[PDB]
């Protein structure tokens, strides 16, 4: 089941989107036997313009270690790029540090508990060092090193959320919503649902981001009017609510 | 989310407006695999005569590190003098310091983290390190030095709000009403809805800077009157609020 | 006579050759008035393949001090690349040390004495500085960076050449002269005279390169042979010579 | 003169042959403008038979630093075989604490004089971290790092044939003699010289091999005879001088 435990700690990182459910569906395919030539997915892999150049890394890193017959593969510079830690030289002696640990231990478990206790800096440059074959270490410690750097971007992920909602600061707090509100009718738009709901569905998300620009237009500062910051946030509650319980419609 | 939680920050800072309006939009393209040519977005956002240069700099930063293929863009000289720092040594040191610590992240929160314990002059200037490839970090960590910028200019503009309501200077504070009512007319002017609304809005709009004016041209000093001043705010007041639920009228 | 002196500095750096007299000559027109377009000119430089990338930032640097009317020229990305440091902190706390002081100068001598007394690492990020415009510094500073820079390259270069002729090991010893016998071979048969000597000089230089390749595939070790090693040298020695008096009959 | 001082050390270490003119001249190649397409010249240098992994590996990566257009090349895996150290965690402990002291130089000596304190393991995994983007140096740096690797193993390349001669064992002792005399026969066969001396070169050469073969199957140990030894020896070394001469006749 390390196919499985692997898949978890790998999609997390990625954003919610179209490029999710493909990226997940090619994990399937390449952990199922149904493994495609790999120059033509990591090319696929390159081209996607959402991915920050970190995550695209690991996605493009993972799929080497499936991939059997090297010596005949190739290493792409995005993936170099990425993995180099920036070339810092003080972080990359931690990665040293850790990749003799990892080089010991082939258990899967054994290789994330050990890596988990360095920087999420090290786990970066390090897990170059096994792209790179700068270094070695057998496939089930490798993705124990992935998931260690996955959990560290993935307990990051959660945690600025954490910190963005509870912000004191009230100017971001109500800018927040307006991007939240065209973020989730952006969803909507983008997936067309199969059913008559997509004319419908893109109506009152065309409706919401129709007028939460308007509402930006406008502002709500309490300088750029005497009392209208409040009425505005409350129609974009109701739209929230409105968007919301539209999801599970077509469902 | 990391795309969402730098649009947060990004867009508090910007005034409201209607290029408010067409950057987020901008971004949204940029931010969803839409990317235009970034010579000609950088371009338009070069001409926009309302965004101060330093807010200017950031949304010029933040496209170039969405675009991929490096050496073939083109570093603007605005971005530059923007993000310069006033080329002071002082505080660029504490930028060298920051820019120390950020290469070791690779996580968003991580670099947004360490980047607010540094004054807001510092990362203007760490910011523009990474710009000019003086430096080199991560995208995630560089967001969170942008966002670490953009609170803490958005702060800057809450706490300015703050302060000049509660300022006890009573010049000012007539003042301060003139000003907001005719930023408050003005919103509805070039804001011409579809509906017939927008002709009522313009006259109802127009009273108020038809009459604002002549409020300032006779003046609200106590020695420029003998008790006109109290009954010449009230006026503003009944139109601060007729122009208050006109909003919500075309909404 | 700065432009002078400058022109020593920046000249010593680059190697012999075609390009060091191409780049001298058009250093004298933007030197002495003739400043043709500043495009064209870094567009040549950047294509030149011998220069280095760091010795090819120089040249590209110094240009741009002479050029006027900034805001309409363009920062080009091989200088930046080259001059940016290796984008460390350490060194690079050390050039905004150095910023300091250069800030506080307006003479040339002045910003080169202090400037040659930190490590020439440092003056290649600070250096960066200036061109970047996270600086800014009077121009007969900016070169006093400039040639503290060349100062400290051209006394390595010849450091370089002392420690190299007098190292003790023979097997470079040996192959350091059937290169250098090539090199002085190929500056003749690419510097194709006027004269009638250069078929002349051609024969005698294609000579010693169609003998050196000889001599390289025999080789000269000491246990590739019973003694060769000993008469091979004998031969070069009077090629070297022989050449060494070819040079100047056309002169 | 750089490109000079690196073509003394990088064919220092090539063994000698018609491999060796081969490179040399495709280095002057590089070394002069003349820069064909690095993919091509890569895969010529992959199929070549005599070169060692380690030693295959610095002409790889000594090309790569030349060609410009980074982002577009292609890291060949061989390089990075050779290159990686045996994956050693120890030594590449010292290639990072060398490569953090690199990467704060920018002079060609200053990276050589420091990457000789240590010791010729390291460089090797160093120069690993350089050719795989890990780490990030200077042009000038990194060669300045070859030539440490290079002349490290000319020095061991000489060390060698300072013992080998020396040696006290007379059983290797008397057979250096065969194979020494079989390679300087072998190095006429294959240079085939365009005059007649062509013919008459290879009946003696293969004179010599012909009977050198005959030696070893008579063989030369004290048990094998009764004082034959003594006269075998003796032939070989009229031989040996028979093809000394011979050499210098062609010339």
Chains 1, 2, 3, 4 share one sequence.
């Not at 700690?9 to 179209?18: A, Q």
């Not at 909602?165 to 939240?180: A, D, F, G, S, Y």
């Not at 989730?184 to 065309?206: D, F, N, Y």
Request: proline content about 3%.
């Amino acid at each position: 089941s390390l196919l499985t435990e692997v898949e978890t700690y790998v999609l997390s990182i990625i954003p919610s989107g179209p490029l999710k459910a493909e990226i997940a569906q090619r994990l399937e395919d390449v952990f199922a036997g149904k493994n495609t030539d790999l120059e033509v997915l990591m090319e696929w892999l390159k081209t996607r313009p959402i991915l920050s150049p970190l995550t695209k890394g690991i996605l493009g890193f993972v799929f080497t270690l499936t991939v059997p017959s090297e010596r005949g593969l190739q290493r792409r510079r995005f993936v170099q790029n990425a993995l180099n830690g920036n070339g810092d030289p003080n972080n990359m002696d931690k990665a040293v540090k850790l990749y003799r640990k990892l080089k010991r231990e082939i258990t899967f478990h054994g290789a994330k508990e050990i890596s988990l206790s360095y920087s999420a800096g090290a786990l970066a440059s390090c897990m170059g060092l096994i792209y790179n074959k700068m270094g070695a270490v057998t496939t089930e410690v490798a993705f124990g090193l992935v998931c260690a750097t996955c959990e560290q971007i993935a307990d990051s992920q959660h945690r600025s959320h954490r910190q963005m909602v509870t912000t004191t600061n009230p100017l971001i707090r109500h800018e927040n919503r307006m991007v939240l509100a065209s973020t989730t009718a952006k969803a909507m738009e983008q997936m067309a649902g199969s059913s008559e709901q997509a004319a419908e569905a893109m109506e009152v998300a065309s409706q919401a981001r129709q007028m939460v620009q308007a509402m930006r237009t406008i502002g709500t500062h309490p300088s750029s009017s005497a009392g209208l910051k409040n009425d505005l946030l409350e129609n974009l509650q109701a739209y929230q609510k409105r968007m919301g319980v539209q999801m599970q419609r077509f469902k």
